Amino acid sequence: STIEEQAKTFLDKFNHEAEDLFYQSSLASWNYNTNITEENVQNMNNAGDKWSAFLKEQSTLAQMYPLQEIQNLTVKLQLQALQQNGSSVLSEDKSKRLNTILNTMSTIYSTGKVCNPDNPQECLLLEPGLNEIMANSLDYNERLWAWESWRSEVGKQLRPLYEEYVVLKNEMARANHYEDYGDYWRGDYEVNGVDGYDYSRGQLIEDVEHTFEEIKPLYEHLHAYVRAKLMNAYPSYISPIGCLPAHLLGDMWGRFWTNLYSLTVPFGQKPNIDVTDAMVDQAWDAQRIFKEAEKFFVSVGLPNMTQGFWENSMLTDPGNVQKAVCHPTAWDLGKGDFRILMCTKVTMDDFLTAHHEMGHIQYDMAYAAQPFLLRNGANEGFHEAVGEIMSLSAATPKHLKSIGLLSPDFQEDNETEINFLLKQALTIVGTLPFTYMLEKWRWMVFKGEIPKDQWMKKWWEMKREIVGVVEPVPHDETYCDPASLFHVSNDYSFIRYYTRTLYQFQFQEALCQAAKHEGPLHKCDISNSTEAGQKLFNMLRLGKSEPWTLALENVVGAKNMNVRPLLNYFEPLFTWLKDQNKNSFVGWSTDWSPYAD
Amino acid sequence: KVSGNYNYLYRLFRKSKLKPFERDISTEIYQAGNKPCNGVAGFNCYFPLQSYGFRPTYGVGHQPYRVVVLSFELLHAPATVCGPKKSTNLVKNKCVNF
Ligand SMILES: *[C@@H]1O[C@H](CO)[C@@H](O)[C@H](O)[C@H]1NC(C)=O
Ligand SMILES: *[C@@H]1O[C@H](CO)[C@@H](O)[C@H](O)[C@H]1NC(C)=O
Ligand SMILES: *[C@@H]1O[C@H](CO)[C@@H](O)[C@H](O)[C@H]1NC(C)=O
Ligand SMILES: *[C@@H]1O[C@H](CO)[C@@H](O)[C@H](O)[C@H]1NC(C)=O
Ligand SMILES: [Cl-]
Ligand SMILES: [Zn+2]
Numbered sequence: 001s002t003i004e005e006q007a008k009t010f011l012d013k014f015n016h017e018a019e020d021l022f023y024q025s026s027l028a029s030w031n032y033n034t035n036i037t038e039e040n041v042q043n044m045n046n047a048g049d050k051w052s053a054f055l056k057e058q059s060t061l062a063q064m065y066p067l068q069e070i071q072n073l074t075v076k077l078q079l080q081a082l083q084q085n086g087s088s089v090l091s092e093d094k095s096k097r098l099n100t101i102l103n104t105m106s107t108i109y110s111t112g113k114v115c116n117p118d119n120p121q122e123c124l125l126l127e128p129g130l131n132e133i134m135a136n137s138l139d140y141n142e143r144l145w146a147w148e149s150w151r152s153e154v155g156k157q158l159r160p161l162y163e164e165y166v167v168l169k170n171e172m173a174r175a176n177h178y179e180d181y182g183d184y185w186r187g188d189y190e191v192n193g194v195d196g197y198d199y200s201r202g203q204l205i206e207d208v209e210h211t212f213e214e215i216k217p218l219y220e221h222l223h224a225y226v227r228a229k230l231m232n233a234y235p236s237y238i239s240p241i242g243c244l245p246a247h248l249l250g251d252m253w254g255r256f257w258t259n260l261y262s263l264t265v266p267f268g269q270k271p272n273i274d275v276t277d278a279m280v281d282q283a284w285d286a287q288r289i290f291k292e293a294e295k296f297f298v299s300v301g302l303p304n305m306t307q308g309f310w311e312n313s314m315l316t317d318p319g320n321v322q323k324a325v326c327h328p329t330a331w332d333l334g335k336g337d338f339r340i341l342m343c344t345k346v347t348m349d350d351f352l353t354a355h356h357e358m359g360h361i362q363y364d365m366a367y368a369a370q371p372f373l374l375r376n377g378a379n380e381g382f383h384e385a386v387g388e389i390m391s392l393s394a395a396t397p398k399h400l401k402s403i404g405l406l407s408p409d410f411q412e413d414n415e416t417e418i419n420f421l422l423k424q425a426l427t428i429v430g431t432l433p434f435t436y437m438l439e440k441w442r443w444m445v446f447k448g449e450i451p452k453d454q455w456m457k458k459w460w461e462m463k464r465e466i467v468g469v470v471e472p473v474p475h476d477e478t479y480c481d482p483a484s485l486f487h488v489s490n491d492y493s494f495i496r497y498y499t500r501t502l503y504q505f506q507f508q509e510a511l512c513q514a515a516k517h518e519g520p521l522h523k524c525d526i527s528n529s530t531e532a533g534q535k536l537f538n539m540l541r542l543g544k545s546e547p548w549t550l551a552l553e554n555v556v557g558a559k560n561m562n563v564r565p566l567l568n569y570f571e572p573l574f575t576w577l578k579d580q581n582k583n584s585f586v587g588w589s590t591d592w593s594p595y596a597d
Numbered sequence: 598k599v600s601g602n603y604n605y606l607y608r609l610f611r612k613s614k615l616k617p618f619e620r621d622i623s624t625e626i627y628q629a630g631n632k633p634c635n636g637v638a639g640f641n642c643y644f645p646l647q648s649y650g651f652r653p654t655y656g657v658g659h660q661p662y663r664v665v666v667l668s669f670e671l672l673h674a675p676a677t678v679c680g681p682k683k684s685t686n687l688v689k690n691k692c693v694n695f
Contacts, residue, residue, distance in 0.1 A: 006629040308656040336656035
């Protein structure tokens with residue numbers, strides 16, 4: 001009779017049929033992913049059409065249900081999650097225009113063709129052309145020309161579509177009762193109805209400012225170190241006191257600096273950490289790799305994998321007999337079913353990726369009994385944060401030697417420690433300032449505080465001081481350089497990377513504290529320690545049924561994200577950087593430009 | 598079967614708790630609210646039966662399990678059903694017990 005029971009019945013029924021419908025859709029998707037066939041194309045076409053229609057119909061049906069302040073904070077989150085119709089709140093013509101613009105940008109990004117004037121007909125695309133051209137060759141002129149040509153051929157046409165896309169998203173968020181699209185995206189972290197733990201949308205911005213103001217010192221220290229190294233390499237093209245060029249960062253857009261580790265290696269003669277020779281000697285396969293993974297997670301106490309995964313999933317590539325994608329993906333079929341897309345190779349990298357994915361599946365059945373919509377994290381960050389904490393647990397030298405892959409006689413040395421910490425800092429720590437800056441720029445653009453005539457000028461200015469990098473070629477108002485990025489064109493937020501990194505470092509410190517480890521944090525190992533596994537499972541079992549702040553506070557006891565674990569992790573690196581950069585200039589000048597004469 | 602064994606049905610929307618050993622077979626239309634639905638089975642009025650299909654790909658803990666329960670009672674009546682006897686093989690021409 002009462003609306004409470006009505007909502008309960010609606011949610012129960014929706015879960016009951018949505019679990020099987022999503023199982024059907026995911027099995028069609030997997031049959032495609034291991035067998036790329038046209039009938040499978042029709043399969044996910046029909047599956048997605050039916051799923052979208054069904055969810056939209058029940059969203060419209062539940063849009064009328066009264067919200068009579070229902071207790072237990074259980075049906076609420078579900079109904080506010082399913083009540084976001086999206087593009088149907090406004091006229092369907094605008095939704096079709098939005099879909100057309102999305103398709104246009106996706107197709108143009110997938111066809112961002114650039115060709116040289118020497119051979120206009122014979123040229124390479126973005127993938128894997130520029131990646132291999134500039135990830136291996138170090139030709140300054142060629143890299144600069146390729147970067148400039150890519151920007152010219154993308155942004156000059158992508159500027160309008162991006163402008164009306166931002167306008168459409170902002171006005172839809174206003175129709176969705178939001179200040180802008182950025183505030184809509186920040187609404188994922190919003191917590192309401194939990195007194196003493198509610199989180200506001202501006203609280204996230206203030207806290208990210210607070211974290212960045214202590215993240216910075218390591219950032220300019222590594223920036224000074226890489227500037228000195230590149231001056232030693234290329235002094236005639238890079239000023240020792242100015243900002244770096246943006247075309248020598250290893251990747252198109254400054255996401256990672258790992259490609260520059262070889263050029264900036266402190267010791268290029270010491271042997272690197274690698275057991276690929278051990279893999280060749282012992283002929284370990286994916287079966288064995290997942291066997292030691294199951295041993296790892298039995299040692300921590302967590303239930304081992306379901307056998308149906310063993311006799312149902314694919315672990316070895318089938319060759320060219322059937323078409324499949326080699327990109328690592330973990331698929332939650334539902335009903336206790338989980339699958340993997342990978343093309344396994346005999347190396348440490350595939351070892352790490354396989355463990356990362358399988359621990360993703362582990363975290364996924366950590367909340368297996370949870371209802372359908374709650375079979376996820378409170379944000380898009382718990383999944384990869386868990387993946388990275390277990391990756392760091394498996395990557396410690398103690399685990400490497402103990403499992404017999406590395407003989408104890410090799411052990412470890414200070415130079416190897418410096419190399420490993422430098423790789424970790426370049427791969428993970430370096431990404432944070434750039435992602436934060438671009439997310440802040442996107443937030444300002446959505447808020448409308450950035451006029452359309454100031455877009456690229458403020459982009460490059462924030463590059464100059466906030467990021468510390470300059471463009472060597474001037475650009476005019478026709479460009480759309482911010483839209484060059486992958487997920488910008490795919491319309492995906494980037495603060496997930498920063499949140500995931502902070503979460504992974506915090507949980508690494510908390511787990512090592514639970515393991516009572518002393519000394520360096522990178523040497524910390526969690527193997528055969530039941531208390532840490534149980535403490536982690538205590539919150540892993542809840543999933544997203546509780547606010548993210550509450551889940552975070554379960555093990556660390558802290559209400560807010562902190563960078564203290566990162567500083568404790570990189571303190572030896574910080575001391576080494578301080579010792580090395582005593583005679584190295586610190587700071588960057590924004591006014592300096594490579595094109596100045 | 599590989600496609601789906603949607604041949605079993607099970608109720609989840611009974612008004613109250615079912616009495617033990619009670620049959621409640623009825624093709625009625627459950628109601629969720631105050632409007633007296635007249636069998637339209639549309640909004641806020643759902644069919645009490647839900648899909649109960651199964652597939653071989655399902656993992657442990659969700660695959661179908663056939664279950665049987667045997668009911669016993671001790672009301673006063675002549676013996677009807679009971680177990681057999683030990684039946685030791687016969688021995689002859691010796692002082693034994695029977
Ligand atoms: C992949 O699809 C083709 C055509 O649809 C089929 O002949 C083949 O058997 C399939 N492979 C597997 C492993 O099912
Ligand atoms: C919330 O509902 C669940 C099941 O519906 C129940 O087990 C739990 O006790 C409820 N919590 C509160 C605070 O009412
Ligand atoms: C998985 O754990 C169960 C529970 O102890 C155990 O019986 C089984 O042997 C384990 N599987 C493997 C492959 O060790
Ligand atoms: C877990 O137990 C094994 C068996 O004795 C032992 O070799 C291993 O060192 C233990 N784990 C740790 C972290 O010491
Ligand atoms: Cl840039
Ligand atoms: Zn992952």
